């Protein structure tokens, strides 16, 4: 299988961690 | 386009009646009118300049014209005549069966002028279409039959599938030795190099004089390499200073003329040397016409081979 569903979650989690760090 | 037996029978009746008509047209005896006469009369009455002869008018016997057709392979009841019909290759496999059967019987009991027929000739003896591997398998089986102690019955069979090939001897032809008014023996030959054409008369006895268009060879050929070419044939057979030559050459340049004379002298000189010496001249390249001639220029390119510059991209 491709990892396209993982990649969506990967970016969501990355952006969330960065938002939390920024705020 | 299938052709039935009744159709061919009618075509042969027409050819025999027309054969008598054609003989009557030309005022020749219809009884002694051969196929060579038919072809000659048809070429006169229907002149065709088409380069491909197969496209020209023809009046041949139906057997020569029409292709071979296999007859029906089953009767009214629908039963095939041959026990190998359902293979689709009954003629090929019947032959393999016959050759395989002979190889078995031998065990129970115990080149230069001929070649094997090609696939297209086997495909006509059998009247079937064959693969390339089918042809090989059949030949591998015939070769296996020669290596055995094949008898007379097993030799007439193998010869049916062998085609005599006419080897052409490479032995150089020799010109006749002629005699002049004074009784001096001489030979005459000709040579071509590029656009130069030479005719040389080599005398059996002489002092080594060579006349080219009436001129001394060293005055006619001031270039030393052109003179080496004249020396080459006589030097190779150890006959410098033993023959007189009078040759005429036209066309081409100085080098092409020296080459044309070299070939003309060598061919004429073959009349005065031993057969073994003539084969040495042949093997030395002295009796072969050089086929290397100028190639035409093609349109869209600078030369015979050179292309126009591939423009910078």
């Amino acid at each position: 299988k491709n990892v396209l569903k993982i990649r969506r979650r990967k970016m969501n989690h990355h952006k969330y961690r960065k938002l939390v760090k920024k705020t | 386009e299938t052709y039935t037996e009744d159709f061919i029978k009618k075509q042969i009746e027409e050819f025999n009646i027309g054969k008598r008509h054609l003989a009557n047209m030309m005022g020749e005896d219809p009884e002694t009118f051969t196929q060579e006469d038919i072809d000659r009369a048809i070429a006169y009455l229907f002149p065709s300049g088409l380069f491909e002869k197969r496209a020209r008018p023809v009046m041949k016997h139906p057997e020569q014209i029409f292709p071979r057709q296999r007859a029906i392979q089953w009767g009214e009841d629908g039963r095939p005549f041959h026990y190998l019909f359902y293979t689709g290759k009954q003629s090929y496999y019947s032959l393999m069966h016959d050759v395989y059967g002979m190889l078995l019987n031998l065990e129970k009991h115990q080149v230069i002028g001929s070649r094997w027929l090609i696939k297209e000739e086997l495909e006509e003896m059998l009247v079937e279409k064959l693969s390339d591997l089918d042809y090989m398998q059949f030949i591998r089986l015939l070769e296996k039959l020669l290596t055995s102690q094949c008898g007379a019955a097993e030799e007439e069979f193998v010869q049916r599938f062998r085609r005599s090939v006419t080897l052409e001897s490479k032995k150089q032809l020799i010109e006749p030795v002629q005699y002049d008014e004074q009784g001096m023996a001489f030979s005459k030959s000709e040579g071509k190099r590029k656009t130069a054409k030479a005719e040389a008369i080599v005398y059996k006895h002489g002092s080594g004089r060579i006349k080219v268009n009436g001129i001394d060879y060293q005055l006619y050929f001031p270039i030393t390499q052109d003179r080496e070419q004249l020396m080459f044939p006589f030097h190779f057979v150890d006959r410098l200073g033993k023959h007189d030559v009078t040759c005429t050459v036209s066309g081409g340049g100085r080098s092409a003329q020296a080459g044309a004379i070299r070939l003309a002298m060598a061919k004429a000189l073959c009349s005065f040397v031993t057969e073994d010496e003539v084969e040495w001249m042949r093997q030395a390249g002295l009796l072969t016409t050089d086929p290397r001639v100028r190639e035409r220029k093609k349109p869209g390119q600078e030369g015979a081979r050179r292309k126009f510059t591939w423009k910078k991209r």
Binding site: - | G49, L50, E52
Partner: protein
Amino acid sequence: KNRAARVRVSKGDKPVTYEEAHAPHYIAHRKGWLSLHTGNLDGEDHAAERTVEDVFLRKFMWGTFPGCLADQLVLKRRGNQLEICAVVLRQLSPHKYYFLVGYSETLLSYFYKCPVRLHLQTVPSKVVYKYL
């Protein structure tokens, strides 16, 4: 890819004549010329005029025998004689073929100021060489 005078392969249902089935490189090899005269020989004159006359006669005969021509015309010139040899079909009544022969021979003789003869060979249907 070359296109000139090439009937292209199809599904095997298109009947072509012998004339149609041969590309130009077969001219003088497998097929002959449809007009024979002396204008294109070395040292001969009036090739341009013979060419115009030939183009007209082909168009003229196409429309004078509409739907009747089964193959290209063969044009023959001997001296001042002009012979037109045409392969036609057997649909038109013979009376119409005699009318059009008399009409065409006469009209063309006065047009080009030469004795013109028309030779008709009839076939039941267009002769098929192969199905491309």
